Amino acid sequence: TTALVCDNGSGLVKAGFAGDDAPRAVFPSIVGRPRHQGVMVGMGQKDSYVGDEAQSKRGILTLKYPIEHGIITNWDDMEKIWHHTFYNELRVAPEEHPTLLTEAPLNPKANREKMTQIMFETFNVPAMYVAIQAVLSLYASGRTTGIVLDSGDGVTHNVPIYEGYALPHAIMRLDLAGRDLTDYLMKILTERGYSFVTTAEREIVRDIKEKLCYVALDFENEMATAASSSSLEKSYELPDGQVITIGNERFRCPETLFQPSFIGMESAGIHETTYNSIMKCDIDIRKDLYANNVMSGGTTMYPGIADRMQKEITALAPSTMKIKIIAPPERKYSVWIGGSILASLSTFQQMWITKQEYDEAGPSIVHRKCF
Template sequence: MNQFQFNFEFDQYYYERDYYQALVFDNGSGKMKVGFSGDDAPRAVFPTVVGRPRHYNVMVGMGQKDTYVGDEAISKKGILNLKQPIINELITNWDDIEKVWHHSFYNELCVAPEEHAILLTEPISNPNLNREKITQIMFETFTVPALYLEKSQLLSFFFSGKPTGIIFDMGYSSSRACAIYGGNILNETVQTFPIGGKEIYDNFELILNNEKIFSYYLLDFFQSCHAKFSYVALDFEEEMKKNQNQNQNQNQNQNQNQNQNQNQNQNQNQNQNQNQNQNQKTLKEITDLYGYGKESEEKINEKLGINKFKIPEILFKPSIIGLQDIRIEDTIINCILKAEEELQKDLANNIIICGGISEIKGMKERLEKEIEKSRKLNFKPNIIEIPLRKFSSWIGGSILASSPLFENLWIARSEYDEFGPTIIKKAI
């Protein structure tokens, strides 16, 4: 393994148990991340969505399945009703999440669930009834041999290797900050910011969709690596001025070039039209077959323009989308101030950001600037960007579930058979 070094041999460790390598499921509102413990990254990442046909007669010749999950559902969204079984981090549709888990076991990982222990992530606010329902489905429907639930924020912090600090998890539907001390979440410090990746992705997708040349695969590619095409401005007003000046200069140069080359362009119109048709066809082939290419990246950059930094500004100016009197930096500041005074300096010195949109360029610098500008803390904030932070929760689970020190924390099937779903309270 590249990222992690363990002081034991996996083969020997798992041979001594009654089941094979443990699985890790990170249940995200936007994306499911699933894979094997001990791996450096999830084996599969797909949208947490289930689709059902709007009209079954249009499905003739397409297998006529009752449900579609993940990428397949999104790719057929024109003829399906799509639902997300996880809303604001909480499971709200048990039939659909069961289909997502079934898809994860049998289609993505191609394993028999009865042969693998499983660690699942859960939100800080997960009610006991939800925890018991998850436990019941895993033991009774999928007959797993062992189970463990852990808070996704705690797993992300575990991956960072820090003993004390703040985890700011910039999730799909919202963002959460919490303080962690001695391996435990300090519940009194938990703060929620109501904007997450969905707001950012939806606004970017709206722009790309309006161009009417982008396939689903390209949009999914963009969501997977949006940080490549977007950034957070350190000073939004200055960035706007700079771009306006650049656009004025470009327009002047373009007008001069058009006047100079007008005759030449007229002679080449016919050839250009032919080439344009061919180029559009080639772009469509690239995006449909591979999801992206050099041409696709250039098109995205061209079409986004100032939106590359204007849309992420929603995080720092929620009033743009009608949310008043909230600020992203206050989420972190209030989290720190809710902790005991003697912990606050250490917490401010170890602010770890994670989640997909935390990878947008300039996020660390802008957050630090806004926190300092508020003057609500008596010490300078230090924001830490951990590697692979869009997978940090899954990776933390991978490390934990593969450690022999974790062995006595699993809830075994024999315990479930004796105590039923309430056994999960043991893991709190």
């Protein structure tokens, strides 16, 4: 009777039963296939490797991500990832359990049909739903009013919610995300002669960004000091014993989120879209949203991001308005934790799209029960 809260994270798939408080599995969404012929006969080899397998065989595999900007580009890759998720990681047969998926808002409608038909006719789920990720993030705080800024592996979006009403004219989609910051980090490391090229090495640079990067409060003073304050510089080890030394490159990376023109992006910075979504609201409610500005998603984990956000938005919003950036701990899981709560809420049983209803309407039925 418990729901399977699944997910379609662009980076990490997340899964675990409702009523639990932490996800049971987290693993990268990678499909990999061998690049060279097997020559030691009888390995018990496989045609393809997924999850942890592909982070270990990482020297001999072509790696693909089947998700780009939240749009699934290859359904035969994407179908294998789920076929692994149910049968091997959770080890639970899906035809007993209602399955709750998620996606970003403002997606090409054809994706919502494909996921529905795969669930109803490969896996034969009893029922399905398709929630909108930012809405689930808000239940983690137990609030009912706030602007959500959510920034995953592959997209950033804003959704203002007031009194449990969404304002669908105000949503912003901003295609700037951790995958872009990683691809930019490869170019500034090349200034020091370290060279990375392959998909096997992208997965090594990403381990730097999770450990040594932090956000400066006054980037101009910081970068002027970094010319002399050698105490900034830090050292890290590759898999082989090759040492790496890192300097002002520690913070020129996450500075991209506040000045996307560094990666040549035309779209405004994350605070300028956070502000400009409030300006779409009726001139009453603005006072309430400045008190409930909630952040989620892993690309807000960098130490000091909340302190920067407050100082930036204080320059835009008028004075006498107080601003309260609510950036709680564990915000790397809120989108999943909120999923666990909602799937347990007694009233939601009205919304399960039945198998019988799809056979009469055809796939388009899921356009009737969303924004």
